[PDB]
């Protein structure tokens, strides 16, 4: 792989549900790449259906200069109006992917736990989720890193 992801640090975690995601990413480009590199953050609104995935943000750079690069990838929180009530509270997934010439070469997945923090709400959760009272906890210590063979030339 001509692009290697050296580190991903999850920032501002845990945080309120409405806070933007912040991932500090360090990567190495072994050689100059003439085409475009695109990073994306995708929120899994529903483990029951991929139709509820929300692309929170995307960053594009091209050509890609060789060397060591670092940036904080920030994305606004998902739209709660598109999250099924059954999936709002509890564990879900957030993904960071990178593509080169449209080919996905790396996917970094985290479990995300959205939970109430006050006793009354944890003991009597409202039938309609209250996103203003949810805390997002990204399970940052163990991301699932998947790499894919792509054509770099």
């Amino acid at each position: 792989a001509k692009v290697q992801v050296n580190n991903v640090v999850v920032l501002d975690n845990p945080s309120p549900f409405y806070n933007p995601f912040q991932f500090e990413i360090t990567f190495e480009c072994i050689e100059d790449l003439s085409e475009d590199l695109e990073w994306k953050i995708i929120y899994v609104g529903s483990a029951e259906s991929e139709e509820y995935d929300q692309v929170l943000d995307s960053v594009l750079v091209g050509p890609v200069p060789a060397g060591r690069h670092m940036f904080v990838f920030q994305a606004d929180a998902p739209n709660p109006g598109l999250i099924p009530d059954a999936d709002a509270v509890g564990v879900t997934v957030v993904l960071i992917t990178c593509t080169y010439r449209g080919q996905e070469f790396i996917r970094v997945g985290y479990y995300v736990n959205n939970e109430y923090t006050e006793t009354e709400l944890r003991e009597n959760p409202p039938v309609k989720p209250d996103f203003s009272k949810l805390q997002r906890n990204i399970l940052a210590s163990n991301p699932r890193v998947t790499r894919f063979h792509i054509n770099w030339e």
Binding site: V44, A47, E48, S49, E50, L95, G109, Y110, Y111, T146
Partner: peptide, 9 residues
């Protein structure tokens, strides 16, 4: 319908 908790992979 929760048995895709392998979306992280």
């Amino acid at each position: 319908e929760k048995x895709x908790x392998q979306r992280i992979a």
